[model samples]
Target: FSTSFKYVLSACIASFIFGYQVSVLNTIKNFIVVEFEWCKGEKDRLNCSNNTIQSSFLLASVFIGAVLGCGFSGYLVQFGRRLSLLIIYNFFFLVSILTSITHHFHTILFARLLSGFGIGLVTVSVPMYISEMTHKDKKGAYGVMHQLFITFGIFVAVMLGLAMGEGPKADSTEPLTSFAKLWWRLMFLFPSVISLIGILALVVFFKEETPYFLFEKGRIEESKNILKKIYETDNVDEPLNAIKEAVEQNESAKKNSLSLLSALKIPSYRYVIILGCLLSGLQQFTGINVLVSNSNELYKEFLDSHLITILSVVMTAVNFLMTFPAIYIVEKLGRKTLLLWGCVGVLVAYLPTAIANEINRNSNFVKILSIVATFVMIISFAVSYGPVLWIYLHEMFPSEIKDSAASLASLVNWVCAIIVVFPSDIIIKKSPSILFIVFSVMSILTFFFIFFFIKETKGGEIGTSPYITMEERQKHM
Candidate 1:
């Protein structure tokens, strides 16, 4: 029990770091652009028009890192999930520290890329570890915890950015002072430290190397011991049996070396991959990350004044508080129901938002509408889709292919994220309404997808064989 708790806690912390780093960039984009003179041809200004292009470019690099990370993560998992995370943690820590010390935009961009690579690795590995460590019945709650921490990280990053103020605003086009312009660097450093701490904690205190890892190494007794540690009971027959089943599946797959293409052969696996892609793609296109990434810019566009600090605090608080409903209702309300309702809520919120953007001539009304729209959108996401997607992705696969499948799914997610984030500035500048409209259509499609294709795994057992009793499968299905 203690080992399981430790692993879960570490996974959550690692996930929080991933979430915080990814979202914090949204708040700090303006600061970076203003300091580095990356804003194209705009006269001395700390405004959205100046920062959007450069911000999108830098954010796009994060996806580049993610793509590389996810593409290679399958091989990396062969090194053992915990050790891989430790290496990534240290690497990002060094990169983040370097990013902090640099004044050049190129240098900072490189650092962000490195940090993003670390996040990508964590996204693939942490979910796998949590799924392996947790009991099946608790998988939904455990998986949702990843998303909850992601929101928590977002909440923390926003609050910190807000508290730190918007670094230094330059009117003379001179380079912003390092001391005055350290907020973005500090934001990166915060996650670096948290990840390093998690690595240290795991290394020094935790001993449960996942049973799957041991099975992969052909260490049967060691695998059983690890399972015993996780379950904290003397009896290891059930876990040992599960490991035997897993090994058999692994051996069958070994006839053909693991590759992304081969992993998609199973129908269930294919469904999971597509579901993960669509779900993650929708998550990005929902315009939540765009708003968070460009919070300052969005506020300026709507308000004509940069109350970035105030708005950040308000929205972060809303995001932080909204997770309660997800935690409370995840078990009570089925995943399909929650996702369907969430998509509907997104449509409702976003339509009004697009309309508000189109018609609000007065800046104050626009600001108020934007705030209301953002609030409703966050709440809607929290209650239904925000946590559920993570839960579903983490629990969707059987033990044999869980790690490889998760890497593939997470890669799809990161690829979609890159696609959404890299083009976001262009989308926002060209036609913000069109972006929301597209998301609304996607949400409607998602509603049908879930209704038609996805299954409910709530309160199900993990590691149950494909040939499990009909009654058991029926109960879970």
Candidate 2:
């Protein structure tokens, strides 16, 4: 493979590891609720009761952590891109390990908050890093890989949760715990181990910093050397040209100013940030997390015990596998097409899903249809909204404002995520049909937004584009 390909691949792997770590929490939420019930001596705490409220609280904490992390990421980049990421990765490793060992829900919540914070940091940095390091021709593919890994991570976590089902029955009087007494603990621990391995690999084997970042730090020679290593070629002009282009582009732009206020002043930066935030919000609005978090509830509502585990596993696997299409088609189809079509898919898939849920309120057939609809919805998401959002967010801003732009967007994303998560059980309880309907509406809006507002970003160079400047973007608008 070419030098750019190799470097992009490595960056993709790193982003994937980060995605996996972030998504694992979705799978573990159910177990955490179960464990919280056992700890609190509550029998009916799965819904929006106090126990569930506490779970939401914990998730809120994670969102708060994410917000803080994203807000600070702009400053963190000044320290050194690779170094900041490594530090955050270590933080995730430590927190995940602590979360596994901690028995108290409050403590675990704290640990999750820390882990989410690290993830937030990575969410902003990794995409920016990948965008900068890879050639413009390959940006969409590389960016889509980030989301593919996230789905892969989610898929693995869901399967693991299913595999580690509640353990043996201790007695008829007492509820039996799945996977023995500490299955949830193990779930938390496993991801930590994986993250640690990723951190080690990143630290030891992949140490190439983005040339843009290196140039920003005034380490021109070091940047050239690292670019050569990344490209794996003696001809340094191409990589050097990329660096020079970035440098010249940003020469008159903002320098070392990544403050929220500064970032919002630029229209191009604001638009990208808003777009990223909207995509993240829409992803959660699709109700995938609600399904994962309340798998047992969904099954119970439909009154189907048979194949429940299989259904969950299958859905997760399909979601993960479908992400590749998103990655592959991103370059070929362009961002607007993927996003617009994905939204349409959500409308089609969710109509059936909601109808099935309403009709099969208690039928096994309805339950199966619901599962199918979910599978379709997730697949749609994987191929369109899931991967496209990350790629678009990563490419929206020029290198000068990338860190701040990503952070602002990611912060909004996490906040909206928390908002969507907290109301899920309540919404499902009141009317399961409305859940899909609301998402369908959001998807429709997303489609129109993409068609009218979002520019075609295919084959567009990062810093060399007309859209790179706020004035230029405003003129187009």
Full-model lDDT for every candidate: 0.69, 0.68
Regions of model 1 farther than 4 Å from truth:
39-42, 47-51, 170-179, 182-184, 256-258, 263-272, 304-306, 355-367, 460-477
Clashing pairs in 2: 166-178, 166-179, 167-177, 167-178, 167-179
- Clashes per model (N, Cα, C within 3 A): 1, 5
Question: Residue 425 CA error for candidate 2 (Å)?
Answer: 2.8
If scored against the real structure, what TM-score would every candidate get? Answer: 0.87, 0.86
lDDT of 1 at 274: 68
Q: What TM-score does candidate 1 reach? A: 0.87
Over 263-356, each residue of candidate 2 has an lDDT whose tens digit, in order, gives 5676656666666566656667766656655665666654444466677677778878888887679988888888888888888888876777
Q: How well does candidate 1 score on lDDT at residue 423?
A: 72
Q: Which residue pairs clash within candidate 1?
A: 26-293
Question: What is the alpha-carbon lDDT of model 1 when measured against the actual structure?
Answer: 0.69
Q: After superposition, how far is residue 200 of candidate 1 from its true place, in Å?
A: 1.7
